[PDB]
Amino acid sequence: GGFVAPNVQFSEAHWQGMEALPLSIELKRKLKLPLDLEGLLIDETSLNAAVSGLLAGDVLVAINGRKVKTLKKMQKETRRVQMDRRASLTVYRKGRLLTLTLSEEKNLGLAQVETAPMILPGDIMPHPYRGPCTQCHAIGTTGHITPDPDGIVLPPGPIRAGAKMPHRDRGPCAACHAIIQ
């Protein structure tokens, strides 16, 4: 269960703590950004990228002065300076073109890319239409991990009589727990 189209494109890149995604018209209108703007959207920053001053909602225009309008082009670029400890960040925020340094005490490394997750034939589109489905998704059931862990509930599990309450008052110990005597 894994049919992939001959052109599955990249949905995102992760690099020194920033998640980067193509800046679509969907997203440009959704975040009320100018529609001439070319670059990558940064929607999630942690660790080294957040440290460098980089916030979410920011658009990644360039690195080291070279323009990055696509993921493919942004990767190419991280490969170039992957062994460096610093690269420059040209960013678009609130109409200002800011600059930032990104840092790492070993080396920056290559930004790794992702496609949209593999989906089921009968699956429901949770987002506005964007084009034929095989264009971003692989169709099938592998690349799974289904049922998704997060939707599995754990039986709270046996407790000796007079156990100590780790959690808030939730009700009679006997409703959720199997008691031991």
Site of interaction with ligand HEC (CB under 6 A):
11, 116-117, 119, 123-131, 133, 135-137, 150, 156-157, 159, 163-167, 170-171, 173, 175-177
Backbone angles phi, psi at 66, to 5 degrees: -85, 130
**19-27, 63-71, 91-99, 173-181 -> range binding its own copies (CB under 8 A):** 19-27
Choose the one of its own copies, ligand HEC, none that binds residue 178, judging by a C-beta under 5 to 8 angstroms depending on kind. none
Q: Rounded to 5 degrees, what angle do the CA atoms 35, 13, 86 make?
A: 100
Q: What count of other Cβ atoms lies within 10 Å of the Cβ of residue 141?
A: 12
Query: Per the structure block, which two tokens stand in for 31?
Result: 């975040």
Rounded to a whole number of angstroms, the CA Rg of the chain reads 23
**Sites for its own copies among residues 27-46 (CB under 8 A):** 27, 29-31, 43-46
Q: ω before 132 within 30° of 0 (cis)?
A: no
Q: Which CB sits closer to its own copies, 106 or 164?
A: 106
Q: Is 180 helix (H, G, I), strand (E, B) or coil?
A: strand
Residues that bind its own copies (CB under 8 A): 2, 8, 14-17, 19, 26-27, 29-31, 43-47, 50, 55-57, 79, 82, 106-115, 117-118, 126-129, 138, 142-145, 149-150, 152, 154, 166-167
